[PDB]
């Protein structure tokens, strides 16, 4: 959906200046699960800040479903991102003083929607993510995987189009990580929604359909999978990450 | 739990209050001790004691409320983990009783398994004699007495097969096997099994199978066909059974028709009920009235609809609607 | 989602976590109300000393309010940084920056004002206990009454409203500054830093060991050594935490080899990683703790020896300089049914040279060594010794002057008479006193000569340095009786209060130092209760930022019974390291000028240090409780 | 349990000590109040508090130790009636758990009895057609075919009788009926029942019964005798079975002896075990091997001693020792 | 050495009963390198968990070294699990603050074997796994194929009786996977030590001596290999997997 074209971020703090990004070009379509992998020190987090409209940009044209984030004001941009985007972070941000249901229903409380639709949306999300039985527990007494699954389900209650997601595997073991990635892949197929993961773990990236390797200007290689069986793709991504 | 806690601890409180009452009372008999200062002391002791009582209340009246929380509604794990030694023993006793109940349940399960195993042992020790008796019977020469003996043997064989299928309807879930079935060999096998009944009752078979391929469970389909043929033979005399299979849409149907007494319309919806026996004829007492119920129960997971059309004095029509081929992929893959 | 419910739930969560903050607020408000009520009581005027008595409570209040304000502001700036994830999430959801302010400011005003209202009601309740405590350190037989003193209410309300206004202004800026974001090996530098820190601290101690005695023989050189020592000790304390702990811990780690158990793992990891970050905080805590302990101990040392110094300053129970006043006092004692002993001894103010007798340096000037003023008395009037010709015996001990002016063995003393000089020798030094401090300069001993030699010295009697009265008419009293009646009789003898008694000086000294002991003790208690909470909060954060480690360890076979055992040692080291350094600072501060105050040590320091350690430990245990709470929920 | 009680009530002791310290301090700092009276009061109150702690210890320790003895023992009444509300709550919770366990156990037992009754009804409805075939088939003409059919029917009837007595061995005590039994007619009936097998195998009988009258129950004794005769016939080939009954002292001895293959001495003690089958010949696999066990288990309530004397290659002697008449006096009266 | 008869685990929410073990009976002779593999919805992971002490048995009995440990008790079970049954998790589980030698020596510090014995044991263990040149590195500086070797060395040092390996080579490249498997096979060959390993990779399980194909909580045949080369056993394993 979004188009990356000559995306650059200005700098110039004190006297020393660095340009982390030196040319960015991506053209992707709905129903994709791209992973923008890379290397340490390449400013991938800076790419998240620029791409997620969190940090203001200076050069380049980016069109979110035909809408450019430089074509409106800061308040309008904030409303656009709050009504058309969703976020998942490395560490879950869950209030302790609320329930597993109220945590998921908090984003759609200010919009002033009738209770029945919100209840139906939570019901279907919790059933399709497998936490409906934990309907009214507290985040104090649930496992490590369920907290991250709840955080992921929070970013699906308002039906967005692009799901930005920093590394959702930092504080999870292998079983929970595999379960969460399987749930995300199931979410992608059912409802059309673009997911842009950014992680440097080949195990997490092997679940995707497209991998982009950023060296200094995001042009190193581009794997495409196509018809692999989640193991040959794993070896391919390992070889590509090890060649450099 | 204010009143309960206060009644629980009404001796320590009395001890402290008696302490301070004695301190006040020794102020009226000793001229070397004033009254205002003693009042001040008692005042700084009352305040401290009240605060301490409130804190000890709110700490200690938790476990005995969790116990009432767990008692009847739900949440077997409602009771809070013990912190003081005294509550630990209560929790241990409750857990011990629960695990004793679990052990009793396991022992009951083992006893049920042993009883069921003895049941199959008797089943096999009875099923061997029927085969031996059939082998011995297939050696005779006379007509009428031998026909009666064959009728009795077929009746017992059918009854034992009904009993075994009733036993197996509990584990049909793990024994299902769906494949292509040829209707003609199955019908011929059922006719051969029921040869003696038809010979004695003078009942023929009209085989007109436009459709020759069906998709269901072969064993249970043969069971249903045999039960329908047995019912038609028993409930009809000097009549020909017309068995017709035709393809309606994408689903195959098989029709069995008899020219017997028929079923009264008031009892037609209740034929499939468990243990149902008709009071129209005294001979219906010998019929167990269990084949139709078992057939309907087994046909439901096979996506086969059973319909009955009976008119008194005309006959009865039974039709089985075989499911579509595509509907079994969801059963094989899941 | 009915924001009121969220506010109420947040307040309920806040109360059960930061309860030490609430306790500190209540204690501070109560103590401030107690002092302000005590200041305005008209019964405070019975405390008679050099200082007025109602003008020291004002200084105590002004000192207390600053400490309370600093503690409150720092605690409230610690609290707000633990609520950054919530603010970032609320900004992502869609709330503005003028609603988060209200949401997390309406759950704080209720707590603060509840504490303020409760503290006042428990402050009218301790306002008489403080009076009774004060009227026992300074011996006064008055009575204390219970009242309200409405001025204290106004003062307390105004002060704490101002502090809360500062808190709110500080909170608003942080909220209006947040961005939507935020949602090894030893070098050659740390070695040098640690070595410099230890060397500086040791040099400071060694320089502080000399001070009063030896060099620095003026008023513009001593105030250089004091500044040098203070600066060196503070800088060494600061450099101890940055580098000198990492060096020692690294040596200990790379001395075991590779065999480490659970306790060593937890302790070494925690100390090495975290003790460096809080370098300015621990320095302040250590220095202020040392200052408080040292000041309190010195005040107690001075207040302890009042009886002995009063008995030493005046030789007898009463001292008289005028014959008319002495005979008047004896006349009033005649009909009081009290009998007395009177004795008088003439005294000669003569100067001699004893420059050859000290074992120190001639540079200890303190007057002309050939012109020291000494008191000369005979031997017939003395009933204790029988001296011979050419022999001189001194009087008194006065532990202070021994270190300032050491005395050697027998030598020669040249008498600086008008036109003659008879040499004598120093026989020995006594311990009792025979003349009041009026005739013996500051504390200089007095010489004893033979009667025959005295018959020539009094013949000389050079009138150049003689005092107003060369006589020691001093009356005594019989065995223990009613001394107080004779005390007011003596008081009414002298309307000019020119004579000296053996009780008024003791009472004045006891009052003057008791007030200081009272003030310093209460400020020290307040500082202790203040620092404990800050350390507790820092350890709370440290414990919450280590939960993963316990989870990993709990998968290899270790149970909670070992994790808690390791946590015990960790907390012991973490709360004990800042205490021993403060104890050493205070102990080396006390044992450098103790002789300027009293004559007996080791009695006060042990008591003060034991009290401080007990309170510090009772603050220590609650951190172990919190760690036990955290470990359980890390399966 | 001293430590377990002094660790559970540390807060109240600490509060009491702090109150004493507060009283002493305030008394000390005030000149009006003396400082000897408060000390004497402190000492007396401390001693009284020690006695009070002992008194409080006794009751609660006794009750809780009783409860802990209740949880793991064979005494359900070991729990004392609660005196304080917390113990009332604990007792109520335990009573509710016990009630739930009792309800579920009773439901389980009643259900299982229901399937047992249904199974027994099915067994009856299965054994009746055996009599139907017997009535139909007692008209055969050919000697060899009739002999084979009679042998098979007798084997099936023996299997059904063994199953029936295995079912009734759980209520044999409720079926006992002491009466005088004529041994000769019963033995003749048993011999005539086994006529087909002996005709097929050429087995004769010798009857020499010195003792004619015994005191026992007809049905179970007849079942035991029939099982012994059936085993003797099955384990013998073309041999004459001799039955001798003579009175030895005050006890009646009945001897069953056959000239068959006998029983191996190593297998002699193990014949009485349930389901024992001889491994010497594969023809014994079809035999259940439970008739001897059923007979032995039925002989115990009848106070009848069963003796075995077997020789390999010669035969087996089965001896039944009937009890004395006077020994039934104590059983009949009760 | 292991002996289990009629094991059954019922994992439910007290509302739905779904048994996953149907009375599995297994015998393992001491000194055998067996494997458990098959399908993805079975209970092989649960079977491996219940064979160890991490999970109890709802119905059945298990014997370890003859010593019955089915009645069980928390304080006794913890001691048994600590004193035997070395584990190799799917994750590295390495403490980052400590070096490579402290992690290996830590489990042995609750026995007080002085210093000479500990140093000798570490020398002996590290001489065979080829990590002796890494006595002082930190876990954040060595490759991803050596942390697994360090974990295996940790599990092998206190000479336990039965070693449970749960998917050891699941996130490694082919070269390091083969190296680690060869090291495991050599260690098993030299010193008698039973290893029970659960794998999803046929060439990883080709190094074994026996394979057990758990299918739907049942047995479904067993292989034995014997005197055959690795290649033919690999092809037989692949064919058997293809049949299922
Ligand atoms: C003078 C020498 C001082 C030495 C230092 C002593 C300090 C040590 C002690 C403080 C004792 C505090 C005792 C209470 C601790 C209990 C911990 C706790 O959990 O309290 C929780 C509540 O916490 C509170 O409310 C504490 C608020 C007051 C703290 C205690 C202070 C009382 C008044 C202070 C004394 C005033 C006079 C002082 C003069 C000496 C209970 O749970 P919950 O919040 O109701 O449940 C949550 C609902 N979902
Ligand atoms: C000076 C008059 C009294 C002033 C108020 C008293 C200050 C608070 C004292 C203690 C509060 C009660 C302590 C809470 C109970 C738990 C203590 C424990 O378990 O040991
Ligand atoms: C001179 C007086 C000394 C007073 C000593 C006080 C002793 C300790 C006082 C009370 C401790 C209360 C502990 C309650 C904290 C509960 C822990 C929690 O649940 O968070």
Residue numbers in the entry:
A (entry chain C), E (entry chain B): 3 to 246
B (entry chain E), D (entry chain D): 1 to 334
C (entry chain A): 1 to 183, 195 to 646
Provide the publication's sentences verbatim.
One such mechanism widely found across Firmicute bacteria involves antimicrobial peptide sensing and resistance membrane protein complexes collectively known as Bce modules. These modules are composed minimally of an ATP-binding cassette (ABC) transporter which defends against antimicrobial peptides without transport across the membrane, and an interacting two-component system containing a sensor histidine kinase and response regulator. In this module bceA encodes the ATPase domains, bceB encodes the membrane-spanning permease domain of the ABC transporter BceAB, and bceS encodes the histidine kinase that phosphorylates the response regulator encoded by bceR. Previous studies have established that BceAB mediates resistance against bacitracin, likely by freeing bacitracin from the lipid target undecaprenyl-pyrophosphate (UPP). To understand this critical membrane protein interaction and the molecular details underpinning the Bce module flux-sensing mechanism, we have determined the cryo-EM structure of the complete BceAB-S complex from B. subtilis in nucleotide-free and ATPγS-bound states.
